[PDB]
Design a protein around this nucleic acid. Structure first.
Lengths: 195, 163, 50, 219, 133
RNA sequence: CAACUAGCCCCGAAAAUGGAUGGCGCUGAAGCGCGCGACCCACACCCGGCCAUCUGGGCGAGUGCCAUGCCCCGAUGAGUA
RNA sequence: AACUUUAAAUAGGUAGGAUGGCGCGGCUGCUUCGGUGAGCCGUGCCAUGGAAUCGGGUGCUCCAAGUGGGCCAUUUUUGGUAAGCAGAACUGGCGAUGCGGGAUGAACCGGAAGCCGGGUUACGGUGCCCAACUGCGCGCUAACCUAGAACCCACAAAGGGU
RNA sequence: AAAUUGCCGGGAGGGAAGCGGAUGGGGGCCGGCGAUGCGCCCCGGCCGUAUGCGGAACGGCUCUUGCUGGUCCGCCGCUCGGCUCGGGGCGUGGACUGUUGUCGGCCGCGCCGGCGGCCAAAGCCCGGGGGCUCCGCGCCCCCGGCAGCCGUCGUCGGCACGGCCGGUACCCGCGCGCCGAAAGGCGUGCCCCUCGGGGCACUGCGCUGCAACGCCCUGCGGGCUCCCCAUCCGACCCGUCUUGAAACACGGACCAAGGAGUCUGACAUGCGUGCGAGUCGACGGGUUCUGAAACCUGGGAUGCGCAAGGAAGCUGACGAGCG
């Protein structure tokens, strides 16, 4: 992750200095993105059209401050832009996910939910993709490689806390100083208030 | 909360050991099955438990005809598990034997089946010697047939254009 | 865990190593102004043109 | 986090040592462990229940730990204390020692200021910047077992006897404590007079005026 | 186990007391709870301050159900024969002398009860029946 | 100097029981527009305790018997007709 | 609107496989001038494998109650000058909804509500009422012919001002 | 009995506003609060086992029959010993309820520190050039060496406190040799560091609440009702009608007692029970302890085959596959 930025540090040299005193940009090189998403439901099921309501159920979001991780797809973000004022989303970094799965983790259905406490994360949970234990699971899901959309296959809701320091207003999208919709940087900030 | 969340709370409830089980013998028998099923590997005995729970008004009488017809050398004289009762409206002298076990037998059946061959076994013995529930067919019995699907009332239930 | 613990054993004496690495790096560049120094200079010179 | 780290990234490093010391004897409590103890002839009912044994041992150790460190902020023997709660509260006193109970022995010299020997809790106290030198004071006599307040068993006497009502339930002054206190106090007075005007200061009392802030006040 | 459960039941109280609406101004209208059937009632709509309705969640811990505050389970004892059943329990069950039983028959219940060591309320009921405040 | 743009204020703007930014009052506002923090705050949200209901278990081999019992689960619970 | 070559968006339908494909070889009164073909039968081969996602499970059958006067808001919309109006289209509510907010309000806003302790917020606030900054920052406003002050909402305009 | 009325008492008050209640506190009124616990020893008191005897209910079982295992009481013999009530004598300290210390869990709380990102650079000293200003100071801009410290992003690290809940009643936690008031430490091998130290390996059982104060009786915590003060949804109290009822809709002065989905015949479903190719006693007859109960008959009714308007129908038996 750090070496990606280090690669463009070495190669690029045209981006930084002169360009503040000018508009446009030149050539050189480009850093890719490849990010799964995390979706937490800001706004309730009250007073919204029912096609969008079905989507919340489909991606499971069953109460406010429910969380489920989503993959890398064109289709997935087409689906989320019918839901956009009712959810907030973006990628939370590798580290933040690790320190959140522990807190509000539970088991998966195939039984009920027996949680990710001492004995019961070692001896319960299936996994045929990889080791199903907490730290292993986070590593595989967010690298989004082979059969790690089945290293998704979640508990089924992360029951997030309401955010410390509160929300930004519910009535607006991300651009207008609201909370709702896509933003990679500030979703992890929000989820680290919802510990 | 949710409507999604309410969906989980409004789920199924077929579930019942019957509204009233008057018969003490039925009631103790299902306890015997209840004990053995969770202490054994048997899928089959678990199926028996459900069929002896919810209703008796659903348990089907099975004639000697058709019982005979599916054990026709493609089941080599196994054990026929009959949920309801054997009834005797046939004469062929059936199969030259067969071990038939049931919840109930008619008085005529007790005489007739054993004098054709094998033995009229009780369900108490079925539980005893096969908690494992193997080499066994739940033979049959219908009520879904020509008479009394939705074919009720006075004048049935129709071909179907209007009713 | 176990997995977390094995990473945490590595991290803890390497907290000291981060401070050491930073300070040593600064000292190393100025010892000479031959080839060594010029390599460091080139990246900075190129990046401050534009 | 920092104290607990050795145990956390070890798991049972201390407790490993004890087993290996026992094993240094040779071959021992693996064999002895199965054989060891009592059982089989009950009382009353099932006997489903509880304690003595095992359970007592970690609990006594854990309860000892708050007595320095956690409560303490830091305080060395001979620090001047402010008692903010307790009976004697508002008196500044000199710290003799920390007991096994975790309560503190103090004593202001009896003649100048009323404070007796006494046990007081650490939790109450504000640690002040002053130290009075307790180099050559015999605090040794006063111990944890010294401070047992007699209960209302019967008469104070040997036991088994028909007794009278003239007991002290919530109180009791042993005569011996009064004799002993004078001796220990004498050494303390020498240290107190060495720094000027400390002696009067202890008895006067500290309290917060209107407009005073306890947060800003911190000694 | 048993002891902190007792503490939770006694100290917390949902002695809410379920009073019927407008019981206060109509004397004949009973103190006893009956559910407001009509939509128009504020109590039905679940307005607070209008006296909260009985629900199962108000209910106490399962262990502490039908217990005397001593943590004894109360049993009304009709006669001498029934005391033998209580003897098995001892601590767990209590003996309380029935209303029907007259004063002479109360005495024989008390003396037997003493042997079982289930002295509490049994003796107290009898003593009043003699003559006592 | 002239023509404009658009802010607030003024005019246009007059009704009857006396009167209503809800009230008091407020002019480097407590007004009006806007920014930034901190903070306040629903039976909502979380954690824990606990109730029933539902779900999944479990424990009868008899000789304490509720085995429609007991015990462990976790989620859920407004509610007229 | 009762015109349209043209022509959106949001809506709407279908498909994305084992209820499938392929090989083998049987029958017919069909269909082929022709076993040519079509359909349907026996037998063999090919799994996670047919985008995504979810199914605190789903599928199915019998039987019965109530309802059969609805009403409202945002949006779309027809009649009407209009209407808290009459009538549609979509959806959410009320009806079946308190609690919190809008001073106050059945429908607006926030959120559906077991029972409690502790935490934390929403809506909306923080001069006092009334819990809470007479907090910081940067402007504007001086109103004797109605100063101004929170969606819905308790109205308000053309036009004028050196 | 309710209603009402009278007396009197209590609360409250004659400066103050009423839905009559909830919520909080105080008064007023009253019931409750291990019989007072444990270990040990001495005296006093009572009894006696084992084994022999004598009489028996028992067991596993076998079960003709057999062998192994009984306990108990009567109460004698032969040897010993124990228990219980009370008193004496010593040690530990148990009685509702309220309070305080603590360990663990959860959550908040303020504060401090590090590294990296953002070529890193504001920055200062040194050096060089340019522009602007063209009145010059000065202003700006850029580039190379530099203490330095910065706003924002990410992450880790450390403290200081508290609330609440619970005391962890089976693998949460932990002890079992030694010293040390104490906490705490004390093996050994391995490897990294090779310094200070670190990480890493190596036995089985038993088991889940610790410190303190008051008093239990003197005396008193408390519970409950009214009242006053505090606080609050207070859409008028409920029901009904209605989209909507507080309604300037309708009924109801108050209270007692009556007072309205019943019962049946014939039906559908469901559920239970019996029996089952049958089934259904009871019109009837037998009989009787007498409106009964018991017994029993042929049946008749319904079903076990149908389909037509009807006559009728080779006359409904060859017997079925597939997913």
């Amino acid at each position: 992750a750090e070496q990606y930025a280090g690669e463009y540090e070495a190669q690029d040299k045209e981006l930084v200095q002169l360009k503040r005193e000018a508009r446009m940009k030149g050539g050189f090189y480009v850093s890719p993105e490849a990010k799964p998403l995390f979706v937490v439901r800001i706004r309730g099921i009250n007073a919204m059209h029912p096609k969008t309501k079905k989507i919340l159920q489909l991606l499971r979001l069953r109460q406010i401050f429910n969380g489920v991780f989503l993959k890398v797809n064109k289709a997935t973000i087409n689906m989320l832009r019918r839901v956009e004022p009712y959810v907030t989303y973006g990628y939370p970094n590798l580290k933040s996910v690790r320190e959140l799965i522990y807190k509000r983790g539970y088991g998966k259905l195939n039984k009920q939910r027996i949680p990710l406490a001492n004995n019961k994360v070692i001896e319960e949970g299936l996994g045929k993709h990889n080791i199903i234990c907490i730290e292993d699971l986070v590593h595989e899901i967010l690298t989004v490689g082979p059969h790690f959309k089945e290293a998704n296959n979640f508990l089924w809701p992360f029951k997030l806390k309401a955010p410390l320091g509160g929300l930004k207003k519910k009535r607006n999208h991300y651009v207008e100083g609201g909370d709702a919709g896509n933003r990679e940087n500030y979703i992890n900030q929000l989820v680290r208030r919802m510990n | 909360m949710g409507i999604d969340l309410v969906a989980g709370g409004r789920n199924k409830r077929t579930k019942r050991v019957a509204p009233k089980s008057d018969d003490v013998y039925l009631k103790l028998l299902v306890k015997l099955y209840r004990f053995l099923v969770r202490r054994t590997k048997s899928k089959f005995n678990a199926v028996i438990l459900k069929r002896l729970f919810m209703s008796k008004t659903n348990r089907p009488p099975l004639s000697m005809r058709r019982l005979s017809n599916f054990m026709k050398g493609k089941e080599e004289k196994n054990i026929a598990v009959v949920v309801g009762t054997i009834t005797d409206d046939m004469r062929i002298q059936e199969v030259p034997a067969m071990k038939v076990t049931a919840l109930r037998f008619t008085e005529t059946a007790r005489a007739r089946i054993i004098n054709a061959g094998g033995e009229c076994l009780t369900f108490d013995q079925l539980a005893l010697r096969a908690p494992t529930g193997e080499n066994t067919i739940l033979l049959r019995g219908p009520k879904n047939a020509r008479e009394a699907v939705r074919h009720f009332g006075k004048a049935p239930g129709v071909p179907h254009s209007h009713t | 865990k176990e997995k977390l613990d094995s990473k945490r054993t590595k991290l803890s004496p390497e907290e000291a190593a981060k401070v050491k690495a930073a300070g040593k790096a600064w000292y190393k560049t100025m010892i000479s102004d031959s080839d060594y120094a010029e390599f460091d200079n080139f990246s900075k010179w190129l990046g401050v043109t534009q | 986090m920092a104290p607990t780290s050795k145990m956390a990234l070890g798991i049972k490093r201390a407790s490993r040592s004890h087993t290996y010391h026992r094993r240094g004897l040779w071959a021992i409590k693996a064999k002895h462990g199965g054989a060891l103890p009592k059982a089989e002839k009950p009382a009353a009912i099932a006997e489903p229940k509880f304690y003595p044994a095992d359970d007592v041992k970690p609990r006594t150790v854990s309860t000892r730990k708050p007595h320095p460190t956690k409560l303490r902020s830091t305080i060395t023997p001979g620090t001047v204390l402010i008692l903010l709660a307790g009976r004697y509260m508002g008196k500044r006193v000199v710290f003799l020692k920390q007991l096994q109970s975790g309560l503190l022995l103090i004593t202001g010299p009896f003649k100048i200021n009323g404070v007796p020997i006494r046990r007081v809790n650490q939790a109450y106290v504000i640690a002040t910047s002053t130290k009075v030198d307790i180099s050559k004071v015999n605090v040794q006599k006063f111990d944890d077992k010294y401070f047992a307040r007699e209960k209302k068993t019967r008469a104070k006497k040997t036991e088994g006897e028909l007794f009278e009502s003239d007991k002290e339930a919530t109180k009791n002054l042993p005569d011996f404590k009064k004799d002993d206190q004078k001796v220990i106090d004498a050494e303390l007075i020498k240290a107190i007079d060495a720094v000027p005007d400390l002696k009067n200061y202890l008895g006067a009392r500290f309290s917060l005026r209107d407009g005073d802030k306890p947060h800003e006040m911190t000694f | 186990m048993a002891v902190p459960l007792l503490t939770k039941k006694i100290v917390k109280k949902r002695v809410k007391q379920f009073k019927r609406p407008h019981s206060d101004r109509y004397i004949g209208l009973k103190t006893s709870w009956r559910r407001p059937k009509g939509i128009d009632s504020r109590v039905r709509r679940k307005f607070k301050g209008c006296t909260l309705m009985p629900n199962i969640g108000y209910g106490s811990d399962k262990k502490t159900r039908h217990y005397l505050p001593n943590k004894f389970k109360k049993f009304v004892v009709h006669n001498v024969s029934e005391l033998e059943l209580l003897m098995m329990h001892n601590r767990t069950y209590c003996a309380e002398i029935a209303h029907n039983v007259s004063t002479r028959k109360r005495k024989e219940i008390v003396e037997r009860a003493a042997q079982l060591d289930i002295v509490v309320t049994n003796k107290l009921a009898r003593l009043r029946s003699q003559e006592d405040e």
